[PDB]
Design a protein around this nucleic acid. Structure first.
Ligand SMILES: [Mg+2]
Ligand SMILES: [Zn+2]
Lengths: 104, 263, 158, 37, 83, 94, 169, 1107
RNA sequence: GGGGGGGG
DNA sequence: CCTGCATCAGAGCCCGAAA
């Protein structure tokens, strides 16, 4: 069906989690020698998606006959790497934190 | 975080604003498990707020967080959305486009009002997809992939290419724009007449609408692709169909300078 | 149609109108240095004097053109609307006129030269304050206009 | 622009804006007054 | 009520319009609270979406107009008139 | 100017309707290879190449000239849009 | 401290290179080359290892850096996206599979199906000897043979349909 | 040819050395040429002497030295190094506790050296540091805007060396003092410095209501120590007011001659205004254990007397050039130097506490890094260090003489943009940028010198009673307003004042006075204008707005291979090239030994044999060819200061930014329209307006984690035709014609895990080629560029003398040259601000031509003149006409130049050659000259009833000519102005600017076309362009721009597929950057969703983000 | 806590 | 009740922009 409206509304912590594919646990980015993304860091493929299309991280499942499988060894979905543009993560706060827009 | 030409790395500011958040959350988690005094837990809890507040809207409250050894505020999500360089005004209400080009402007007294002179080397590129298709329907290349290979090197362009182009752009218009586009005739459609040389030829009568001099002005070219876009241009945006001002109702295309002088 | 220096014709009427101006101008300073009328009153009445003198020479420039040189290039281009307006032409043939101090208030002494005649260095420096003030003004304006327009589009686009 | 009655679907609002704004550069109370109004 | 153009603009229904104008966080804050739905009535909204603007060739007045040649037009009409 | 544009604005209540008809029709012919054209071999818009006259490839040129003849009909809710598609592909294949 | 976090002892080595160099420069009255650092570091250190230590120490730069001017220029705006295919590339890859299968079916699709099962249009089904023991239609060394005959029938089939040369780049 | 000089004005003094604002400033800052005792306490010396001694043990500073540069100038340019000297400092460590003293010479790093012409080389590129104008420090009194009868005194120090302070007297009646946006009763401070109620009343009493308004009893209930703590609580709440730390805060704030610095100039101006003498450059002292006032009461005293209308008390005009000074190169750099010194001192005191308080030397105590980085940052990234403008030699000379009011310490986002009456003779009123920056950036006037305190002064002649001395006194704006200063042109017999009424100024106001009344006289007219402005003949006849463009475009003239000086000069074009240093001159008298294309060797009287090598075909920052040409022949005898080689855009040592061309001034069938220009193909034929341009191309081979990049001749899949002009190792051979797509440098890179797709390996399986593992990464020629390879530079890892940034093996550079003939699109201009793009090139047979057959070079439209009011170009060509037939060039000084009767005199002499020859060799008047003459007589141009010869002379004296249209042979119905004009070819060439793009690179995040020709960018269709399509109602054109033609990835790939297959483009999909907006709003915890008619959600991600 | 060398 | 009075978010377009 066709787009006719655009709604905007608050997001519950519940719903933020409904978006999320993984909690980002580490401030790491990419490993300094593999330059591949560190797992549970800010670029982890296990959360956000494969870097290369229809190919897992360690290389066990490498093309499209598997679409949607999650590699046992490395844990990455086999889809189009375009997903790294869409898949949200999330950070579980210890203490709650106010959203400054609604404060100031 | 991308490797740019150099093997160097280049990274968006949000990553450093997230890292500051993650450290503080993580360390608060540990100070809790280790039962630290509340003056310590209080201090981190407040720093956590400020990490969240610089991520969401750095600078909004208190000192803006900066990269070490730089005075540059990190650009936070609010910064991205907002302002002249923000998402809305820089990439949603207006983008850069394909099938466009720019050159210096030159008067073309011999043009008819619906025309302009368009450099053929420009026209080659702006219409290049079309040119490839024509190139194979005749025969100057076996298929579209060889056709493109041929126009890569300037030495390997042979004269019958240009006759192929002329066929392509037949009847089609291009758009001309001179910034600042103050009103709707900052853009107007012209049937292009290919020219040697590198300069666009503008028709004398349209210079007023455009506020176009020839003291080095330049003008952008745009090629409407679909049948729909081309029909809009030819009917609604053709120079010849817009002779009157939409503001006063008076003639906009009119004699001026030499044309008056001679008459 | 061409333009050579001789095509910017100083009217004979010009010298007479200038002598008329100085004899009335010394009328005004005796009324000052004898204390009949103010220094504000005197600055005011010489400004209107030189304004009227400027107008006088402008129509002088065009009457001499129309009657004696009706096909002069400057006359033709201005008259037909091809290019130039009276006070531009007035500056080539008559006098440059009153300039303005940085503050905006005008100088009492005008530029008596024309561009054909050529300005004195002091006339040229005097006239520069106005040019520069105009150039800055226009530069701040286009931003104010640009913003205005975006507001308008924003309020009417639907 | 057409010396004739307006076609259903013309983006008048935009046109109106462009019409008022374009002379903008050349206003020497001048343009401030207009903003004030 | 008389407001000038800036405040008038920022007060339209369309939050995609106002947020893209100015005062973006304020505009977005209040809208998100209200659960505002943009009906995409004006042109900026549809520009932001890359949709086809509701003017010109995009007006619902002229958009659905059909064109048929007479040869097709009654070639079709004959097969559909009978049972 | 577009040949006969003053007449083409005579045709419509609203200028944007003219160009909708024109653009629609222009893709009608490009899809059907022009074979559904209303015009006859001497009305066909021609284009001069180096070899000689050939058909004008530009279907927007075509549609406006077609339109001027008056053999096209235009309007809203003429016919269910799906039912056109195949009877046109039936009469003039691709 | 580093956007690319690096092990704690490796940073300890990097910090040492800098202290080493700074004293070097402090006595030499000019910037040392990697060799003068390498020996000042003792055994195990050559100049290539000074050099690869510094490339590791390199910190990333901000996509939001202003390109001088500071008005209207970001570094990131100068950086092309080389991941997503361009319209030509996506068209070239489509074009290839289009005439790739319109060339297998033109001998027969069966022996082109055996070969197509060998490499894989979408899957990459490439091992070597064994699995072929199962379902192609025949036993095991025959698939390798009809591999060649499909390949060389392809190669004559292509000397006529020589439109694939261009894909060689 | 003969040159004729006009002008009655005898100039007592030549122009000063015009780069002296740069050279003298840095030389004074470094003092490298002075023995360290003898150094005065300025610049580098002053920074050291203010940073040291460093207290705890004490590190003290002995002297500094500067070594010689590790590499010479051109050597630095070649290898992308900075031209700089090693800086060493000898310091003695002294232990306060024991008595140990170890002293060593510590290396502080390198300081960049300035070249002879007053520029720098920073990583291989020339740069210029532009002087900054700002408010002089001192004490100022301005009127209170809100309260009319009141005034604010302000004390303002050097930038970043103290706070600014206001002394508003609030409605309350007390004297209030503003600091750091904080207000408080100033009398609070008064007590702190040891005042009490008697001293305030005895000194100040005269002001009935005002002096008693400062008195507040609760504050005196308190000795000076109490009041010290008083205030500290005011200004940093929460900090415990320890008597120790309140002292330190306010001391460092107010009296610390290290954290607070008024100028050396600020010190004098304060002494002069308040009528005091200052012990140092701080507002107060700490002496004998308590605070001692310096400034505050003279400042308070001055304000109260002005309040009351006491005589001798005046407001200060803050725009007056006596209260505004310039921060030259030296000052600017030493400011950055002192900052880096003070940073290094933070590291010294830190290390004077850790690590063994005895086992330490100066060497291990100092870390150079914070000084090195401070200087490197001032030079590479400061916004006053500019990429040199060396388009032509004048470009760089104007650059050095520029004055910016932006910068760290000037304006930014009318009063300061205005021409102030004190600019006269100091800052050019004409040369300034059109646009947003107008009046913020300006140029040093020609005779102006910047003095020790940084005020601009201008020369003036003293006049005694009535006779004009030859003594010249350079004068700041403040001292100028005391005197009556006569105009430069006022008439004089010998040295006596010859008019009984003289035109003079007094405080910039113009006044008529007698010769008894005059105290000084202007040196020259040139002293009021910049160098560029001074290069405009007949400037007295040009409206200023167009003279403004005449100035600035001379900066932009590109060096022509046939460059020639203008037929009408002003007399400054000789020393411009001399001070430019483009041309090369003779040191002493002597005899030329040898003359080569590459070299010229001269033997002087000294016996020495000096060899001058010549820079030939060197590429400037802007790509224009800097090239010196030998102008003397072997054996020629030469004096001191004679010229030996012409620089670029110089002809026989005169500045040559264009060519003299024969111009007719008439419309021409529409190709003249709205400033376009019509030129004759004759100019291309004889290589007029042809210029050489070199672009530089670079490429690096790097070590990658996939393996090495190698600069190869072996490139997968490419024919020998593609590689013919490549040498053995894969770089193009010197002297090859390279055109777009050609390869200049071969290079292979290892293919990423893009490991040929199964689709690809099968493909190459069939051809029996196995896919190589290296990719073609060669450096090719970009679209629209090209030329002939003239040079290659190859720098590898492991060669002697070379090691590159970490990771890169080898870097190759290829210099490509082009000879660019003039073409339609390219920009011409004259010195009067007439500018136009050449729109048409007619063949010689279409050009209007004179009756004796010679055709004009360029046709300019007259419509360009009346509204622009730049009549100087009109006189320029008249005199050009005379000179064309007489074979002369002329020197008409500005404002003292050739006047109409004088030009007619030489025009008459010219007519005899144009016409007397004609009748001589057997030809009479032409039938067509009679038809023109007929209509000219109807225009009142010729007197009726004279022979055709008599009447053509009358037209020739008006500058007009009989012209025959080459197309018809029939005459132009009127007599037309024709003459020689100086017209430059500006740097804006269409070859540089044409650009077009079908598809190309896209931005990382937004997936929208990149920008800019160099990126194969796409044009920006912005906000106002959408409005344009919106008004037109071009909904489908507009939607195309918003999708297919930008970031609608599916629709853009699909559209491209449709066109190369001949179908119409598919209706678009969702722009990727709206998808980006959604996810950024989710990143702000905002749930934005697309719905349908029935309000059911619509998934814009085609299921790809839902689980 | 908001801003700049060139072209139109 | 109203006014000072404070806190915030605005400040033209496109292209070279010489990092
Ligand atoms: Mg212009
Ligand atoms: Zn895996």
């Amino acid at each position: 069906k066709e787009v006719r409206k655009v709604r905007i509304a608050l997001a519950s912590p519940e719903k933020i989690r409904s978006w999320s594919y993984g909690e980002v646990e580490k401030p790491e980015t990419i490993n300094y020698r593999t330059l591949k993304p560190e797992r549970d860091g800010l670029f982890d493929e296990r959360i956000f998606g494969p870097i290369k299309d229809y190919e897992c991280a360690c290389g066990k499942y490498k093309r499209q006959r598997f679409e949607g499988k999650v590699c046992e060894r490395c844990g990455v979905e086999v889809t189009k790497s375009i997903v790294r543009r869409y898949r949200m993560g999330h950070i579980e706060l210890a203490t709650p934190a106010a959203h400054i827009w609604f404060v100031k | 975080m991308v490797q740019v030409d150099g093997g160097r790395f280049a990274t968006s500011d949000l990553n450093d604003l997230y890292r500051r958040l993650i450290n503080r959350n993580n360390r608060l988690k540990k100070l809790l498990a280790q039962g630290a005094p509340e003056i310590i837990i209080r201090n981190e809890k407040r720093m956590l707020q400020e990490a969240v507040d610089a991520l969401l809207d750095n600078g909004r409250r208190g000192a803006p967080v900066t990269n070490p050894g730089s005075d540059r505020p990190l650009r936070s999500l609010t910064d991205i959305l907002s302002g002249k360089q923000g998402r809305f005004r820089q990439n949603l209400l207006g983008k850069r486009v394909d099938y466009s080009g720019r050159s210096v402007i030159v008067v073309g007294p011999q043009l008819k009002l619906h025309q302009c002179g368009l450099p053929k080397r420009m026209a080659l590129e702006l219409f290049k997809p079309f040119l490839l298709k024509k190139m194979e329907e005749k025969g100057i290349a076996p298929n579209v992939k060889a056709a493109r290979r041929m126009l890569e090197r300037q030495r390997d362009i042979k004269d019958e290419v240009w006759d192929a182009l002329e066929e392509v752009i037949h009847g089609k218009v291009v758009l001309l724009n001179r910034a600042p586009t103050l009103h709707r005739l900052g853009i107007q459609a012209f049937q292009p007449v290919l020219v040697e040389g590198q300069s666009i030829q503008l028709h004398p009568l349209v210079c007023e609408a455009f506020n176009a001099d020839f003291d080095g002005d330049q003008m952008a070219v745009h090629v409407p692709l679909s049948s729909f876009a081309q029909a809009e241009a030819r009917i609604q945006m053709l120079s010849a169909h817009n002779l009157l001002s939409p503001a006063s109702g008076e003639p906009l295309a009119k004699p001026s300078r030499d044309i008056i002088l001679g008459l | 149609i061409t333009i050579g220096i001789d095509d910017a014709v100083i009217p004979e009427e010009k010298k007479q109108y200038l002598e008329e101006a100085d004899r009335k101008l010394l009328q005004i300073e005796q009324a000052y240095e004898m204390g009949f009328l103010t220094d504000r009153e005197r600055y005011d009445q010489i400004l209107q004097l030189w304004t009227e003198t400027t107008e006088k020479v402008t129509q002088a420039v065009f009457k001499n053109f129309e009657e004696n040189y009706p096909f002069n290039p400057l006359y033709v281009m201005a008259q037909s609307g091809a290019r130039g307006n009276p006070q531009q032409i007035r500056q080539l043939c008559g006098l440059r006129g009153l300039m303005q101090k940085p503050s905006g208030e005008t100088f009492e002494v005008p530029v008596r030269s024309s561009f054909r005649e050529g300005l004195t260095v002091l006339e040229y420096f005097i006239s520069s304050h106005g040019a520069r003030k105009g150039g800055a003004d226009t530069a701040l304006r286009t931003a104010d206009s640009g913003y205005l327009t975006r507001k308008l589009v924003d309020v009417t686009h639907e | 622009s057409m010396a004739r009655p307006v076609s259903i679907g013309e983006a008048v609002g935009i046109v109106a804006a462009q019409s008022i704004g374009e002379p903008g550069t050349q206003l020497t109370q001048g343009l401030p007054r207009v903003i004030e109004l | 009520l008389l407001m000038g153009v800036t405040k008038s603009a920022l007060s339209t229904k369309s939050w995609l319009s106002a947020a893209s104008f100015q005062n973006t966080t304020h505009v977005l804050t209040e809208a998100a609270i209200a659960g505002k739905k943009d009906e995409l009535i004006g042109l900026k909204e549809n520009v932001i979406l890359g949709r086809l603007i509701p003017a010109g060739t995009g007006s619902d007045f002229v958009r659905f107009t059909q064109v048929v040649d007479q040869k097709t037009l009654k070639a079709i009409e004959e097969a559909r008139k009978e049972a | 100017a577009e040949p006969g544009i003053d007449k083409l604005f005579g045709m419509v209540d609203s200028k944007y309707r003219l160009t909708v008809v024109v653009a629609k029709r222009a893709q009608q012919l490009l899809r059907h290879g022009f074979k559904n054209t209303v015009l006859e071999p001497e009305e066909r818009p021609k284009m001069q190449t180096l070899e000689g006259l050939f058909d004008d490839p530009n279907a927007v040129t075509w549609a406006m000239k077609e339109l001027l003849t008056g053999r096209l009909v235009f309007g809203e809710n003429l016919v269910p849009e799906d039912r056109l598609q195949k009877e046109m592909e039936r009469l003039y294949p691709v | 401290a580093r956007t690319i976090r690096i092990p704690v002892h490796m940073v300890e080595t990097i910090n040492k290179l800098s202290r080493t160099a700074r004293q070097l420069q402090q006595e030499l009255g000019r910037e040392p080359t990697y060799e003068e650092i390498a020996e000042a570091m003792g055994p195990g250190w050559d100049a290539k290892r000074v050099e690869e230590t510094l490339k590791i120490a390199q910190e990333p730069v901000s996509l939001e850096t202003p390109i001088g001017d500071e008005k209207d220029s970001f570094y990131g705006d100068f950086i092309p996206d080389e991941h997503l295919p361009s319209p030509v590339d996506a068209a070239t890859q489509s074009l290839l599979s289009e005439e790739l299968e319109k060339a297998l079916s033109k001998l027969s699709e069966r022996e082109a199906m055996v070969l197509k099962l060998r490499k894989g249009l979408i899957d990459g089904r490439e091992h070597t000897l064994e699995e072929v023991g199962a379902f192609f239609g025949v036993t095991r060394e025959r698939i390798r043979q009809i591999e060649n005959k499909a390949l060389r029938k392809l190669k004559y089939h292509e000397s006529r349909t020589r439109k694939l040369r261009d894909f060689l780049d | 040819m003969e040159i004729k000089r006009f002008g009655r004005i005898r100039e007592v003094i030549p122009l000063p050395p015009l780069t002296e604002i740069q050279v003298e400033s840095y030389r004074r800052a470094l003092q490298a040429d002075v023995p360290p005792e003898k150094r005065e306490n300025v610049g580098i010396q002053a920074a050291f002497r203010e940073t040291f001694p460093i207290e705890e043990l004490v590190l003290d500073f002995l002297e500094y030295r500067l070594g010689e540069p590790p590499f010479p100038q051109d050597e630095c340019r070649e290898k992308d190094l900075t031209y700089q000297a090693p800086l060493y400092a000898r310091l003695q460590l002294i232990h306060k506790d024991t008595g140990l003293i170890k002293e060593d010479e510590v290396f502080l790093g390198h300081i960049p050296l300035m070249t002879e012409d007053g520029s720098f080389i920073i990583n291989g590129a020339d740069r210029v540091i532009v002087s900054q104008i700002h408010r002089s420090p001192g004490v100022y009194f301005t009127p209170d805007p809100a309260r009319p009868g009141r005034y604010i005194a302000s004390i303002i120090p050097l930038p970043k060396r103290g706070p600014w302070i206001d002394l508003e007297v609030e409605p309350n009646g007390v004297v209030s003092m503003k600091v750091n946006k904080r207000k408080f009763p100033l009398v609070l401070l008064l007590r702190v410095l040891g005042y009490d109620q008697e001293t305030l009343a005895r000194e100040l009493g005269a002001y009935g209501e005002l002096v008693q308004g400062l008195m507040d009893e609760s504050v005196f209930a308190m000795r000076p120590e109490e009041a010290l703590i008083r205030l500290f609580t005011l200004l940093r709440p929460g900090d415990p007011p320890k008597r120790d730390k309140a002292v330190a805060y306010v001391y460092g704030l107010i009296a610390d001659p290290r954290r607070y610095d008024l100028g050396e100039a600020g010190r004098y101006k304060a002494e002069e205004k308040l009528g005091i003498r200052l012990s140092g450059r701080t507002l107060a002292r700490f002496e004998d254990g308590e605070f001692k006032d310096e400034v505050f009461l003279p400042t308070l005293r001055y304000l109260f007397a002005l309040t009351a209308g006491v005589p001798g008390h005046e407001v200060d005009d803050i725009d007056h050039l006596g209260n505004r000074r310039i921060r030259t190169v030296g000052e600017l750099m030493t400011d950055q130097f002192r900052v880096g010194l003070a940073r290094l001192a933070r590291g010294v005191r830190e290390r004077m506490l850790m690590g063994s308080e005895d086992s330490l030397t100066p060497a291990k105590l100092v870390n150079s890094r914070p000084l090195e980085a401070a200087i490197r940052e001032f030079f590479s990234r400061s916004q006053l260090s500019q990429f040199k403008d060396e388009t032509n030699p004048l470009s760089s000379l104007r650059h050095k003489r520029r004055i910016s009011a932006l910068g760290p310490g000037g304006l930014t986002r009318f009063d300061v943009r205005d021409v102030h009456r004190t600019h006269y003779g100091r800052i050019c009123p004409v040369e300034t940028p059109e646009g947003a920056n107008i009046g913020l950036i300006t140029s040093l006037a020609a005779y102006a010198r910047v003095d020790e305190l940084g005020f601009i002064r201008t020369p003036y002649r003293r006049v005694v009673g009535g006779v004009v001395t030859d003594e010249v006194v350079y004068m700041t704006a403040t001292e100028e307003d005391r005197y009556t200063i006569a105009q430069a042109n006022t008439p004089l017999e010998g040295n006596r004042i010859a008019a009984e009424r003289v035109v003079a100024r007094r405080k910039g106001e113009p006044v008529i006075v007698s010769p008894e009344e005059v105290e000084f006289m202007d040196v020259s007219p040139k002293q009021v204008f910049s160098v560029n402005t001074n290069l405009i003949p007949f400037l007295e006849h040009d409206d200023a707005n167009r003279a403004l463009m005449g100035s600035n475009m001379q900066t932009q003239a590109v060096p022509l291979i046939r460059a020639q000086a203008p037929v009408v000069m002003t007399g400054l074009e000789e020393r411009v090239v001399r001070d430019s240093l483009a041309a090369l001159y003779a040191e002493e008298d002597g005899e030329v030994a040898k003359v080569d294309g590459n070299r010229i060797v001269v033997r002087y009287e000294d016996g020495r044999l000096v060899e001058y090598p010549l820079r030939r075909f060197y590429r400037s920052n802007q790509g224009t060819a800097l090239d010196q040409r030998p102008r003397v022949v072997v054996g020629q005898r030469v004096r001191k200061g004679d010229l030996l080689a012409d620089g670029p855009a110089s002809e026989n040592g005169f500045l040559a930014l264009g060519q003299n061309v024969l111009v007719a001034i008439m419309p021409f069938d529409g190709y003249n329209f709205e400033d376009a220009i019509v030129i004759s193909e004759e100019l291309l034929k004889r290589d007029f307006y042809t210029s050489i341009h070199i672009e530089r191309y670079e490429i690096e081979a790097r070590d990658t984690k996939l393996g090495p990049e190698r600069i190869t001749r072996d490139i997968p899949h490419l024919s020998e035709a593609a590689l013919r002009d490549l040498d053995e190792e894969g770089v193009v051979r010197i002297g090859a014609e390279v055109k777009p797509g050609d390869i200049l440098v071969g290079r292979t890179s290892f293919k990423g895990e893009s490991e040929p797709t199964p689709e690809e390996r099968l493909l190459r399986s069939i051809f029996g080629e196995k896919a190589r593992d290296v990719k073609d990464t060669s450096l090719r020629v970009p679209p629209g560029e090209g030329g002939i390879v003239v040079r290659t530079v190859r720098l590898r890892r492991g060669d002697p003398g070379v090691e590159l940034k970490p990771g890169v093996r080898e870097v190759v550079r290829v210099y490509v040259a082009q000879k660019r003939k003039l073409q339609v699109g390219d920009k011409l201009a004259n010195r009067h601000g007439n500018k136009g793009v050449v729109a048409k090139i007619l063949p010689v047979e279409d050009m209007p031509h004179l009756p004796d057959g010679t055709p004009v070079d360029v046709i300019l439209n007259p419509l360009g003149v009346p509204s622009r009011m730049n009549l100087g170009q009109i006189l320029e060509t008249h005199l050009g006409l005379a000179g064309y037939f007489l074979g002369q060039r002329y020197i008409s000084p500005i404002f003292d130049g050739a006047k109409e009767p004088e030009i007619k005199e030489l025009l008459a002499q010219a007519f005899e050659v144009y016409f007397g020859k004609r009748k001589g060799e057997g030809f009479g008047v032409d039938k067509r000259e009679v038809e023109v003459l007929r209509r000219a007589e109807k225009l009142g141009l010729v007197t009726p009833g004279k022979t055709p010869e008599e009447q053509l002379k009358e037209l020739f004296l008006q500058g007009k000519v009989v012209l025959y249209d080459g197309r018809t042979g029939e005459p132009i119905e009127g007599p037309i102005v024709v003459g020689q004009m100086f017209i430059m070819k500006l740097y804006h060439m269409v070859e540089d600017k044409m650009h077009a793009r079908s598809t190309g690179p896209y931005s990382l995040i937004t997936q929208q076309p990149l920008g800019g020709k160099a990126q194969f960018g796409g044009q920006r269709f912005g906000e106002m362009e959408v409005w344009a399509l919106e008004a037109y109602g071009a909904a489908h054109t507009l939607q195309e721009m918003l999708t297919l033609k930008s970031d609608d990835i599916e629709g853009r790939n699909a559209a491209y597929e449709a066109i190369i297959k001949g179908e119409d483009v598919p209706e678009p999909s969702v722009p990727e950057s709206f998808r980006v907006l959604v996810k950024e709003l989710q990143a702000l915890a905002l749930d934005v969703q697309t719905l349908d008619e029935k309000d059911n959600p619509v998934d814009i991600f085609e299921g790809l983000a839902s689980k």
